[PDB]
Paper text:
In order to investigate the structural basis of inhibition of PaFPPS by N-BPs, we determined the structure of the enzyme in complex with ibandronate (Bonviva) to 1.85 Å resolution. We note that also in the ibandronate complex the active site is in the open conformation and the lid region is disordered. Molecule BFQ1299 is located in site S1, the common binding site for the DMAPP/GPP substrates and N-BP inhibitors in other FPPSs. The hydrophobic tail of this ibandronate molecule extends into the same pocket as the isoprenyl tail of GPP, which is lined by residues Tyr78, Ser79, Leu111, Met153, Val154, Gln157 and Lys180. Like the diphosphate group of GPP (see above), the bisphosphonate group is anchored to the protein via two Mg2+ ions (denoted Mg1294 and Mg1295 in this complex), which in turn are bound to the enzyme by two aspartate residues from motif I: Asp81 and Asp83. A third Mg2+ ion (Mg1300) is bound at the opposite site of the bisphosphonate group and completes the trinuclear metal site seen in FPPS–ligand complexes from other species. However, owing to the absence of the hinge motion, motif II is not close enough to provide ligands to this metal ion.
Farnesyl pyrophosphate synthase (FPPS; EC 2.5.1.10) is a promising antibiotic drug target as it represents the point of convergence of these two pathways. The enzyme belongs to a large group of prenyltransferases responsible for the principal bond-forming reactions of isoprenoid biosynthesis. In summary, this work provides the first functional and structural insights into FPPS from the opportunistic pathogen P. aeruginosa.
Residue numbers in the entry:
A (entry chain B): 0 to 227, 247 to 291
B (entry chain A): 2 to 163, 168 to 227, 247 to 293
The structure:
Amino acid sequence: SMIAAYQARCQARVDAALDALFVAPREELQRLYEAMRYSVMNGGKRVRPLLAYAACEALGGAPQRADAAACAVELIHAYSLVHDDLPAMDDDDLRRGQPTTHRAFDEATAILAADGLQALAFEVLADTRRNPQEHAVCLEMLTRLARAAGSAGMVGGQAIDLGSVGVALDQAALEVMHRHKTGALIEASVRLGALASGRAEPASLAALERYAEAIGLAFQVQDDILDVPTYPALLGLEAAKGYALELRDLALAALDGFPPSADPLRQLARYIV
Amino acid sequence: IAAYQARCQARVDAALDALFVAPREELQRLYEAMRYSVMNGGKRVRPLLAYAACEALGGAPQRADAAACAVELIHAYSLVHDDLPAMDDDDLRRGQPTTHRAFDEATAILAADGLQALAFEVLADTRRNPQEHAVCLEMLTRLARAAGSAGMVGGQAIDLGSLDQAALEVMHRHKTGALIEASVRLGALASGRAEPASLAALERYAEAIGLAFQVQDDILDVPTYPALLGLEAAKGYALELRDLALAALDGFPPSADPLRQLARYIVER
Ligand SMILES: CCCCCN(C)CCC(O)(P(=O)(O)O)P(=O)(O)O
Ligand SMILES: CCCCCN(C)CCC(O)(P(=O)(O)O)P(=O)(O)O
Ligand SMILES: CCCCCN(C)CCC(O)(P(=O)(O)O)P(=O)(O)O
Ligand SMILES: CCCCCN(C)CCC(O)(P(=O)(O)O)P(=O)(O)O
Ligand SMILES: CCCCCN(C)CCC(O)(P(=O)(O)O)P(=O)(O)O
Ligand SMILES: [Mg+2]
Ligand SMILES: [Mg+2]
Ligand SMILES: [Mg+2]
Ligand SMILES: [Mg+2]
Ligand SMILES: [Mg+2]
Ligand SMILES: [Mg+2]
Ligand SMILES: [Mg+2]
Ligand SMILES: [Mg+2]
Ligand SMILES: [Mg+2]
């Protein structure tokens, strides 16, 4: 499809940029940097960089402008996975059939590698060579990423998730959890791409945020459907399917008035379901 | 400078205290862990440095509030992770349960991850850190490079990956030097009066004191400086480091006295 090709292009672009980020400054840091590289260069689909690139092109921006945004979101994503896999959390030996970072290396090294990837995400956005936007915009990007990645966003989601082991969640609570744990970063990816366009305005940003909210949930509902507290458990399988379609429609409706260059976002919304 | 310290401490604690309000109820416990990890009665050396660097260059100290917060937030998150079972495995810090004991291990990992996000948030926030934009960006750049795999986190890995004196110093310069230097650099930037020669002088200062802390702590506890150099020679080196710090400040005006007093204080403990 058009979306499969767009994804492959986004993936190649962000991987080339990311690949350059993992050279140890000196020899004693080689293994730390190898763990960082292992944690990022893992053949991931790069959905968050796709969203950044696509939001940028949806507002008329050349996609290379969003390279730093794309790297930063993926660096936050990657660090999150390394921490999530740790024995204190999900305790997973494998991710996509490969040894998790703490399994490949060791637990200390994985914690640190990921800590350094979070630093690096902020580094790339603050770096005016790598992220050559107007200064006020670089700062806004950093602000939005920090709020999305932190205790009010993604890390908060993780805490909500750990804090409801034992509790039977209803749909509202499930959605609170999801909106933090994954929504915040998906929204930031769209917001930061849009900012990288050089043409953001408040109406277009707010529309793109409605898009991001809808697709972020649509991802979760559809994943649950395909794995068949989950959406099908709550609603039954057919009604979950209906809801996935309702979310796709909300996303497409949010893009009303956008030009043909927003097609990749429209295509993705449909693809998800 | 015990009184200057206590003032820096009260200033930064007031600003930090305001950062730990959970946006909603489901996040209360996370935010409590964050607070517990920061509001721990720490001496706030890094904020003292940021404030004092700012004043050394003629800047009113409140201009450095965000820098002070950011460096302390990085410092605090680093302690939580350093205390974990996979690293130093400490049950206590300053006689109190470590965050992973008071709460739980996942919560401690997460609380600290959110402190690191928050440090960058505070510097990028033009209300809390109201400098010129290019200066905000430069502060963020320097903190990110200092906190990350090329600085502080690198130092942790070097330590775990381990010694002659050169190698000990490589380790220290990453593990603690990078963040001490960033604290001084960020305060200096917050002054609005930074210039390259002064920034370079202040960096020499920070390099010297960072090491002076480590040398003197090893001396007092008697791969340590006394083991490596001999006890009396380590004492000599501590003085040498203090003098390098004071020399780096030669030609700064009287408002740099707090930095001078700290250099002496370190080696007089
Ligand atoms: C540490 C913050 C992570 C926030 C959510 N991540 C996407 C976690 C990764 C997951 O999607 P994954 O299935 O483990 O990949 P989880 O089910 O554990 O939530
Ligand atoms: C080895 C293949 C395992 C399953 C692969 N996907 C389900 C992983 C995607 C995820 O991590 P996510 O939480 O769905 O986004 P999941 O939890 O569904 O697994
Ligand atoms: C990422 C970790 C960087 C932290 C560097 N030090 C401040 C850690 C704390 C120590 O000083 P502490 O004595 O545990 O407080 P350490 O001796 O373990 O280095
Ligand atoms: C295996 C340790 C080699 C690194 C240097 N030290 C001896 C570690 C011990 C410390 O971190 P600790 O706080 O005493 O555990 P120190 O502050 O003495 O450096
Ligand atoms: C780099 C600033 C040093 C400030 C003094 N330290 C807190 C003294 C205590 C130590 O030596 P200790 O291992 O706690 O005894 P640390 O490793 O924490 O530095
Ligand atoms: Mg998980
Ligand atoms: Mg998991
Ligand atoms: Mg999962
Ligand atoms: Mg320790
Ligand atoms: Mg340690
Ligand atoms: Mg200590
Ligand atoms: Mg020491
Ligand atoms: Mg120690
Ligand atoms: Mg010791």
